[PDB]
Paper text:
We found that the deficient mutant of Os1348, which encodes an 85-aa small protein, exhibited weaker antibiotic activity than wild-type Os17. The Os1348 protein was annotated as an alpha chain of nitrile hydratase.
The final model included four Os1348 molecules consisting of 2–79 residues in the asymmetric unit. The six C-terminal residues were not observed in the electron density map and appeared to be highly flexible. aValues for the highest resolution shell are given in parentheses.The Os1348 monomer was composed of six α helices (α1-α6) and formed a Magatama (comma)-shaped α-structure. Two Os1348 monomers joined and formed a dimeric structure. The Os1348 dimer had a semicircular shape. Based on its three-dimensional structure, the free energy values ΔGint and ΔGdiss of the Os1348 dimer were calculated by the PISA website as −20.4 and 17.0 kcal/mol, respectively, suggesting that the Os1348 protein formed a stable homodimer in solution.
Author numbering:
A (entry chain B): 2 to 78
B (entry chain A): 2 to 79
């Protein structure tokens, strides 16, 4: 689609919710951050991602970030 | 992976950030909400998803929800 590839956008903003360092990189430099994980944001998607307030995302994400991080380190197959 | 399939989890919580109604279905009934979009959450991922406060997620996502919603309706192919 031209403006919204909603599954690729979900991968990007979902990672931001799950990853404070990625969220911050994405807020500072969205097209480049998303390219680094293999996603192309349209100019529509870049402006939408910039409308995510980092403090508000941290407030929403801080609990799940902690819980998924502890699980990830020694995760098995 | 047993506990964390991080790309599938990102698809799920990313959709929640972008979709108030999905976020609410996921909070109420996480395993079934995720199955509905073809994701299997581990019990670890279910407890993790339950730790997303709906009001806090709405606060974080209200602006991007509005902006993506208006763009999506008449979106074209390239």
């Amino acid at each position: 689609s031209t403006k919204v590839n909603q599954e690729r956008l979900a991968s990007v903003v979902g990672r931001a919710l799950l990853d404070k360092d990625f969220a911050a990189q994405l807020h500072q430099d969205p097209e480049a951050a998303a390219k680094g994980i293999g996603v192309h944001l349209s100019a529509t998607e870049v402006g939408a991602v910039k409308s995510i307030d980092t403090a508000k995302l941290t407030s929403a994400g801080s609990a799940i970030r902690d819980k998924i991080g502890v699980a990830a380190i020694f995760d098995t197959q």
